[PDB]
């Protein structure tokens, strides 16, 4: 087993954050550590100055090879900063390792007894780009072999390698301190989940097993990689149009550019309702049947597929390549024409999903420029349900994301 080599595994059991490896590390929480808030084995490090202090059974340290794995999610606030922040500290008497954030990079440092160090560095920010990892969960794995290399993997893919043969002795520290410096800036925060240390250098194959197990392939994700939830506000976007929001216009839905180009939190968020009597606020899972609701001008509506296609000459007679616009309906209920299934994009761990309808004909939701009003030449960016979608299953136009208001991404506070 991969887990046979775990010498530390921080997990939430019976409500507390403990070591479950079998080695019984001391695990002490200080200040405002929120644990188990997004994912079971998560914890939050903020400018509260909260800390987690781990003390290993020293005998574990009786040095050739190791791996450290965990997921991390770093606020926009912290990411945008040019400064360096130590996040996990295991250096004492000059030597050990640490994990830092610096200028939108994550950095792993290994330091010898002369204070000489080597590092692995990855630019997760990419200038706060929407295609980068700012405030998104990503999976980190660092492997070390003291006679060779240390290697940095992100989401199961090797990114960087560093020779460490020039280092002299490293004296490992039985203490590991998680946390950043206290600060008045309340929006500086990050989260870690599933923190593990292994006494071997994990192979690429084993790293990918850990990654796929911990990503929770069952669970649809929001834009940040949190679990998607029922009854929760999201700015629903098509992959191709992150700067557009959903609006009703002349009895259909269209995608309109938000006035401030720089903002993720736009207008008209939707909520997702279970068609299958699932628990309130519960996680949305691959294959779930759902409805979309929208509060608009002080009235609650559900989204439904149009009965007839966008092309008037087709009437009710379309058989192939049928394209249906969407509209709002104020009558709320489990109407089949407004029930959709949400699925994960097969073999893609992207924080996106596809949405299908099985009402009368099999359709898939996508966005593109159409003439969506039956009796009009006018163009619009339009979310539509289309038939015969086999050749579109890999098109980014078929991918949807759901942006929640998340404390790691603050806009006009």
Residue for token pair 């197990």 = 213
Question: Which 3-state string (H, E, C) describes the chain?
Answer: CCHHHEEEEEEEECCEEEECCCCCCEEEEECCCCECCCCCCEEEEECCCCEEEEECCHHHHCCCEEEEEEEEEECHHHHHCCCEEEEEEEEECCEEEEEEEECCEEEEEEECCCCCEEEEEEECCCCCCCCCCCCCCEEEEEEEECCCEEEEEECCEEEEEEECCCCCCCCCCCEEEECCCCCCCCCCEEEEEEEEEECCCCCHHHHHHHHHHHCCCCECECCCCCECECCCCEEEEECCCCCEEEEEECCEEEEEECCCCCCCCCCCCEEEEECCCCCCCCECECCCEEEEEEEECCEEEEEEECCCCCCHHHCCCCCCCCEEEEEEECCCCCCHHHCEEEEECCCCCCCCEEEEECCCCCEEEEEEEECCCCCCCCCEEEEEEECCCHHHCCCHHHCEEEECCCCCCCCCC
Among residues 2, 5, 153, the alpha carbon closest in space to that of 65 is found at 5
Contact 174, 55 (CB under 8 A): yes
Burial class (CB in 10 A: 0-12, 13-18, 19+), 195: buried
| Contact residues for 113 (Cβ-Cβ < 8 A; gap 6+) | 93, 94, 95, 168, 169, 170, 171
Angle value at C-alpha 193, between 190 and 196, nearest 5 degrees = 125
Give the integer Cα–Cα distance in Å for 77 and 46. Answer: 11
The pair of structure tokens assigned to 120 is: 């692995």
Give the integer Cα–Cα distance in Å for 265 and 408. Answer: 13
Structural domains for the chain:
1-222 (2.60.120.200), 223-413 (2.80.10.50)
| Contact residues for 299 (Cβ-Cβ < 8 A; gap 6+) | 330
What pairs with residue 152 in β-bridges? 142, 160
Contact 195, 70 (CB under 8 A): yes
Contact 258, 244 (CB under 8 A): yes
Among residues 248, 300, 303, 252, the alpha carbon closest in space to that of 275 is found at 303
Count the Cβ atoms, other than its own, within 10 Å of residue 156.
18
Phi, then psi, of 144 in degrees rounded to 5: -135, 135
The pair of structure tokens assigned to 312 is: 């008037």
Give the integer Cα–Cα distance in Å for 411 and 75. Answer: 12
- Technique used to solve these coordinates: X-ray
Contact 286, 221 (CB under 8 A): no
Give the integer Cα–Cα distance in Å for 413 and 402. Answer: 21
Resolution (A): 1.7
């Amino acid at each position: 087993s991969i887990n046979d080599s775990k010498i530390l595994s921080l997990q939430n059991k019976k409500n507390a954050l403990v070591d479950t490896s079998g080695y019984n590390a001391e695990v002490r929480l200080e200040g405002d550590v929120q644990v188990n808030t997004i994912y079971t084995n998560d914890f939050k490090l903020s400018s509260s100055g909260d800390k987690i202090i781990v003390n290993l059974n020293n005998n574990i340290l009786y040095y050739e090879n190791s791996s450290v794995s965990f997921w991390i999610k770093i606020s926009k606030d912290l990411t945008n900063s040019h400064n360096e922040y130590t996040i996990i500290n295991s250096i004492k008497q000059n030597s050990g390792w640490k994990l830092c954030i610096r200028n939108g990079n994550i950095e792993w440092i290994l330091q010898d007894i002369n204070r000489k160090y080597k590092s692995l560095i990855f630019d997760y920010s990419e200038s706060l780009s929407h295609t980068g990892y700012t405030n998104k969960w990503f999976f980190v794995t660092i492997t070390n072999n003291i006679m060779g290399y240390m290697k940095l993997y992100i989401n199961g893919e090797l990114k960087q390698s560093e020779r460490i043969e020039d280092l002299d002795e490293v004296k490992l520290d039985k203490t590991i301190v998680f946390g950043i410096d206290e600060n008045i800036d309340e929006n500086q925060m990050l989260w870690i989940r599933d923190f593990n240390i292994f006494s071997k250098e994990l192979s690429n194959e084993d790293i990918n097993i850990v990654y796929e197990g911990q990503i929770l392939r069952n669970v649809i994700k929001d834009y940040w990689g949190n679990p998607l939830k029922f009854d929760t506000e999201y700015y629903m976007i098509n992959y191709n149009y992150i700067d557009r929001y959903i609006a009703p216009k002349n009895n259909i839905l269209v995608l309109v550019q938000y006035s401030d180009i720089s903002k993720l939190y736009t207008k008209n968020p939707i909520t997702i309702k279970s068609a299958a009597n699932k628990n309130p606020y519960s996680r949305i899972l691959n294959g779930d049947d759902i409805m979309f609701h929208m509060l608009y001008d002080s009235r609650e509506y559900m989204i439904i597929r149009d009965t007839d296609t966008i092309y008037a000459t087709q009437g009710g007679q379309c058989s192939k390549n049928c394209v249906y616009a969407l509209k709002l309906q104020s009558n709320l209920g489990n109407y089949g024409i407004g029930i959709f299934s949400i699925k994960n994009i097969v073999s893609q761990n992207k924080y996106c999903s596809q949405i299908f309808s099985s009402f009368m004909k099999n359709t898939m939701l996508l966005a593109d420029i159409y003439k969506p009003w039956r009796f009009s030449f006018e163009n619009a960016y339009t979310p539509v349900a289309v038939t015969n979608y086999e050749t579109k299953l890999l098109s980014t136009s078929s991918f949807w994301k759901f942006i929640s208001r998340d404390p790691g991404w603050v806009e006009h506070h």
